[PDB]
Amino acid sequence: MQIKTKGDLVRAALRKLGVASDATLTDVEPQSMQDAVDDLEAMMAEWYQDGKGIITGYVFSDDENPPAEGDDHGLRSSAVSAVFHNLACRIAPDYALEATAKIIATAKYGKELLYKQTAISRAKRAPYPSRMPTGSGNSFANLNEWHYFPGE
């Protein structure tokens, strides 16, 4: 993919919003880019609720490294579009703007697709209760005095 850094995601979001692009004649101040990177970091931290939210492979930059822009986001190829669409939606209010309906629909669809695989992996059935017998059909379990399921 050509989108390999956090700043690349920021530029993609700004191009989606029409605020700035590599084709326009006036591009935003680097402070605006830093603010957008901060918004992206905050959003990603909110999504990734310390491992109990949306898993994306995003790499959170440290304070020791000076430039937050320039580090690889670490996202997979299938996750970039959703991330930068949601970023455009989130940073639209900064410029007294409002993301168009297509951007909002794409952001919703991308977030759903982002969480689809994790939701599939988290649909785990609980084990048998501790008060449930194994049954006489399980000859191996019954010969070894395992009459009831362990549980937990």
């Binding site: 017998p133 049954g135 006489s136």
Partner: protein
């Protein structure tokens, strides 16, 4: 000519002749004496409730 060979030939013919009936009778004895869940070929796959 060999006595052992003739005895074994007769025994093998008789054993192969009545294979299906013997298998069904042994299955009936196991079903009615040991367990109705005659699942020996594949039982060590996962643990699920099997009641008799």
């Amino acid at each position: 000519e060999n006595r052992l060979e003739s005895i074994l030939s007769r025994f093998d013919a008789d054993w192969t002749a009545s294979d299906e009936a013997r298998r069904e009778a042994k299955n009936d004895l196991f079903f009615s004496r040991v367990s109705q869940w005659d699942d020996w070929l594949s039982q060590y796959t996962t643990l699920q409730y099997r009641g008799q």
